[PDB]
């Protein structure tokens, strides 16, 4: 190596700088913060009573952390299709707010909850715009929402003067006028009641049994920091040249127990000439020095 550095075959006595020694770092520890305020998905999926189709319950989710690994890994889920976003990477792209609509429709009508569909459900009760971005889910609930003798509390509407617009709701109960003679709000001939409650029973066939539905839909208008998915904070090692990532602070070096005392709102410390030389561990809240 000396002969190569000098470009010769005879080196005379001396002392020669030949190269450099640089310790090597192994593994990459990515630190971060908890989840804390998270998405209370345990309510929109587990309420004891779900709404009806003509009047669907819309619950919004504020700024939290969303753990979709609870819904993806949980249950049979007879249908699960996500349209704008790929179902797997739901943890790296986040949006301003999510909404979770819910209802109870029939089995053979689940295929109507999709962008660009037609039918008694997609034209009169719940219409999804063609520019959908969320992701639909639906599962069977025959053992809960079905009583022997008929369950007459679910009330899809089947008559309306015009097709619904995307994401509208109509709970009016006026009498539909079919003919040309007004009926002044009473049933009779050519005037009908526009609600046609399902006759749910346990001894039905698949395609006529109740199927609960949840429709997550995402929106990102202009908010810079919003609800987002969860990340990670690998265990923290010490006394080894490591590649570390403190809730944003990316660096390399040896980590060591400190004996300085930050003020209880300061995250990391800097030197003169402005280099990060101490951090605080988010989870345990202890100060650690960073030496190269």
């Amino acid at each position: 190596e000396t002969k190569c550095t000098l470009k010769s075959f005879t080196v005379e006595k001396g002392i020669y700088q030949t190269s450099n020694f640089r310790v090597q770092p192994t593994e990459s520890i990515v630190r971060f913060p908890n989840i804390t305020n998270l998405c209370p998905f345990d309510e929109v999926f587990n309420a004891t009573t779900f709404a009806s189709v003509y009047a669907w319950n819309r619950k919004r989710i504020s700024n939290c952390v969303a753990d979709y690994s609870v819904l993806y890994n949980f249950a049979p889920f007879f249908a699960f299709k996500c349209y704008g976003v790929s179902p797997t990477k739901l943890n790296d792209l986040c949006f301003t707010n999510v909404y979770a609509d819910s209802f109870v429709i029939r089995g053979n009508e689940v295929s109507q909850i999709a962008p660009g569909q037609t039918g008694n459900i997609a034209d009169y009760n719940y219409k999804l715009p063609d520019d959908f971005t969320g992701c639909v889910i639906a599962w069977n609930s025959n053992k809960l929402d079905s009583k022997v003798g008929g369950n007459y509390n679910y009330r899809y509407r089947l008559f309306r003067k015009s097709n619904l617009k995307p994401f509208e709701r109509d709970i009016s109960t006026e009498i539909y006028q079919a003919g040309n003679k007004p009926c002044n709000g009473v049933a009779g001939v050519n005037c009908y009641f526009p609600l046609q409650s399902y006759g749910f029973r346990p001894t039905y066939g698949v395609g006529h049994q109740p199927y609960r539905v949840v429709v997550l839909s995402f929106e990102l208008l202009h908010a810079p920091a919003t609800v987002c998915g969860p990340k990670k904070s690998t265990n923290l090692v010490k006394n080894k040249c490591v590649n570390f990532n403190f809730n944003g602070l990316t660096g390399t070096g040896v980590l060591t127990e400190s004996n300085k005392k930050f003020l209880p709102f300061q995250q990391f410390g800097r030197d003169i000439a402005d280099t990060t030389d101490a951090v605080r561990d988010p989870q345990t809240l202890e100060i650690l020095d960073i030496t190269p």
Binding site: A223, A225, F262, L263, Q267, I272
Partner: protein, 211 residues
């Protein structure tokens, strides 16, 4: 009337510990020896942050209200404190033009479309600022017309609202049985850090040739 701050309205520009290091910053500060209004109440402007001190052993100052119109048709913030504890809130309101047993709260008459909730002598300083949809609040409580001294203000809150602000007010507890307002401008300061990491002194670098 009007009064003169002396060296007031210094806050820690951010996290990151620090010790003896005359560190230099550019930010929005309240210039030294400024012209601060005196109040013994009306709609004020905001325009770029606000310094706000007060004094009273009882608690007459019971929070502020912010926004552009202080009514419906646009959103606003509301920060309140009954004898219980603080209540931050963000809806569209309908605010009394003069909003203010022990029964109270003639403040608003509407709470629509709420997009954020939260529930739970003396000198009490506050610095309010609003950058990139975040509404930052620094504060300090030092106990004994203002006096003369140095005391740096530590960050309290952070709210990712998005709200626009152009005006603000105050809230007071009536009688049935003193406060100042500075404004902040882009200045350059030189902060002296202690060995524990606290700001003990400062220099406003636009005062006199010495600075």
């Amino acid at each position: 009337s009007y009064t003169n701050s002396f060296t007031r309205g210094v806050y820690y520009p951010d996290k990151v510990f620090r010790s003896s290091v005359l560190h230099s910053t550019q930010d929005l500060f309240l210039p030294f020896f400024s012209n601060v209004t005196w109040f013994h109440n009306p709609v004020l402007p905001f325009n770029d942050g606000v310094y706000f001190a007060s004094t009273e052993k009882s608690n007459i100052i019971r929070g502020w209200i912010f926004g552009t119109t202080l009514d419906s048709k646009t959103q606003s913030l509301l920060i309140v404190n009954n004898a219980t504890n603080v209540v931050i809130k963000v809806c569209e309101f309908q605010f009394c033009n003069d909003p203010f047993m022990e029964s109270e709260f003639r403040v608003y008459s509407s709470a629509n479309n709420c997009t954020f909730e939260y529930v739970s002598k003396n000198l009490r300083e506050f610095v309010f600022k609003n950058i990139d949809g975040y509404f930052k609040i620094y504060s300090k409580h030092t106990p004994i017309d203002l006096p003369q001294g140095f005391s740096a203000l530590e960050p309290l809150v952070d709210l990712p609202i998005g709200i626009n602000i152009t005006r603000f007010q105050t809230l007071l507890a009536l009688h049935r049985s003193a406060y100042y307002v500075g404004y902040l401008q882009p200045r350059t300061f030189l902060l002296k850090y202690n060995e524990n990491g606290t700001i003990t002194d400062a220099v406003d670098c636009a005062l006199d040739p010495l600075s």
